[PDB]
């Protein structure tokens, strides 16, 4: 039966369909027309709109409400943000943030975090989209207004809130996945409990330090003005360490089934883009080589985090390189590996010769010795690939040239070229007749530039 039998329920369900499919359109490109209209001169029309929100964030009410004006003007505000055009638009972006950060709009982002303490509501989750879309260039005036405001109008309540924001947020936990596994066997609200808030927190925390503000990375550690001190640098390690155990254990569930389902790929990738994003905001506390910031982060439990991250890479690079259904996943899996070494490279830019910091990086490469040789040997599978397919012994092994030779004339070719051993030729022979010009283009390209920083 298909809605011929009831009458009012047909038109009712049509309404419920029409709202879901047809209504969500994109006429909405007014979002700079309106903000330019409001800044047209007293006090600007836009200027007292932020004077409303800065007052309402200041009257203490011990918690924060929804206030659905705010979620339409801290979003319409943030929808308004090759060498000539790669510097014409840079001045266009720095003008579309002087439209706001002249008007005190670096305060209604920095106050409405300090008012709601630890509440993860959609009140906070639409200022971080504003606080990101203002700092988006790694700006330098706006990073200075936020620091000077946090020293003459001294807030403990901001840094209490940032640890309080960072407290829960997420972890991809598979206990909720297994119930989602079982019920959907006979009949999207698992994934890190709204990951999209967690990316947009640490990406806001990174954009406070881009351009290497050597004061503002040293205001997040000691925080010397206030009475009590929050140490976000040690506390942002501890969020990473909780994401370490998650994506380790979600691999362990897949240790034997080994055919990654579609509901796992869509749930594993969002668990990576938080892990990639949290490593970027671990870089920018270190990169401008502020040695006090990399003292405290060296004594923390970062080293136990990075051990288990290698523990994923030793095996997940192997078993996901077996079918065509994981190549869309395997690129992001390497991109986390590329971004992991980039931060610990930034640990090493203050060594001497026998520096203390590099010595511990030997140690975690000693204390996790047996998991580095799989990833070193995995690159040798795909780095010898480029010339052993280019050698004149193999280019005219069988063919004149077409792009395909055989599987068997492939098989003794690595046995006659005598570079791979027999056990690793079959790892080349997972599925990889073959494709002489595509299999090199598939396999070799994400092998090298990811394998660069390892070297």
């Amino acid at each position: 039966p298909l809605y011929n039998l009831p009458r009012h329920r047909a038109v009712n369900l049509f309404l419920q369909g029409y709202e879901k499919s047809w209504i969500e359109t994109e006429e909405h490109y007014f979002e700079d027309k309106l903000i330019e209209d409001l800044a047209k001169p007293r006090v600007d029309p836009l200027h007292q709109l932020i004077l409303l929100f800065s007052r309402t964030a200041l009257t203490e009410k011990c918690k924060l409400e929804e206030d659905f004006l705010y979620m339409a003007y801290a979003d319409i505000m943030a929808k308004s943000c090759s060498f000539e055009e790669k510097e014409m638009e840079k001045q266009k972006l720095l003008y579309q943030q002087a439209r706001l950060h002249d008007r005190g709009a670096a305060e209604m982002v920095l106050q409405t975090i300090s008012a709601s303490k630890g509440e993860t509501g959609p009140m906070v989750a639409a200022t971080l989209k504003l606080g990101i879309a203002i700092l988006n260039g790694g700006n330098s005036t706006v990073q200075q207004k936020m620091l000077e405001y946090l020293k003459e109008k001294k807030d403990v309540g901001f840094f209490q809130s940032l640890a309080g924001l960072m407290q829960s947020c997420s972890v991809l936990d598979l206990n909720a996945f297994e119930r989602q596994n079982k019920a959907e066997g006979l009949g999207g609200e698992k994934v890190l409990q709204d990951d999209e808030f967690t990316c947009d927190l640490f990406r806001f925390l990174q954009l406070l330090c881009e351009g290497h503000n050597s004061d503002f990375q040293n205001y997040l550690r000691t925080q010397t003005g206030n009475n009590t001190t929050v140490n976000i640098i040690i506390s942002t390690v501890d969020y990473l360490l909780r994401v370490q155990e998650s994506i380790s254990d979600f691999y362990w569930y897949y240790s034997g089934k080994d055919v990654i389902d579609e509901q796992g790929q869509r749930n594993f990738s969002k668990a990576i883009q938080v892990a990639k994003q949290v490593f970027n905001t671990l870089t920018e506390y270190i990169q401008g080589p502020c040695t006090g910031n990399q003292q405290s982060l060296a004594h923390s439990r970062l080293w136990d985090a990075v051990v288990g991250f290698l523990h994923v890479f030793a095996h997940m690079q192997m078993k996901l390189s077996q079918d065509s259904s994981q190549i869309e996943l395997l690129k992001e899996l390497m991109d986390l590996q590329k971004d992991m070494v980039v931060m610990l490279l930034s640990m090493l830019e203050g060594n001497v010769v026998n520096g203390t910091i590099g010595k511990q990086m030997v140690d975690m490469l000693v204390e996790s010795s047996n998991n580095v040789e799989m990833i070193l040997k995995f690159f040798d599978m795909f780095l010898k690939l480029k010339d052993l397919t280019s050698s004149d012994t193999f280019k005219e092994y069988d063919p004149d040239g077409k792009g395909v030779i055989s599987k068997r004339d492939f098989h003794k070719a690595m046995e006659s070229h005598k570079h791979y051993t027999q056990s690793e030729t079959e790892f080349l022979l997972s599925c990889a007749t073959l494709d002489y010009e595509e299999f090199v283009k598939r396999f070799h390209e994400p092998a090298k530039d990811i394998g660069f920083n390892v070297a």
């Binding site: 809605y3 011929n4 038109v11 049509f14 419920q16 047809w22 047209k40 007293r42």
Partner: protein
Amino acid sequence: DDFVAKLQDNQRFRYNEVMQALEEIRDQLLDFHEDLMTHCGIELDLTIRGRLLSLVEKVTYTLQQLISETMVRWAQESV
């Protein structure tokens, strides 16, 4: 009302004629809401799908000028 009237039987008539003349019932034997969304979300990506594309262009919307003018005109002149 009449748009679902030219839809509730017509697709079902194609169902009833193809039930003898012929995956087929596997898609037309799902739940009601998923079937309604499947019939509706394909019209933008039959001959009935010309009616909705005349509809949504006509449900665009004047006082919308003068309201949005006067609200900012009040704020421009005085604190």
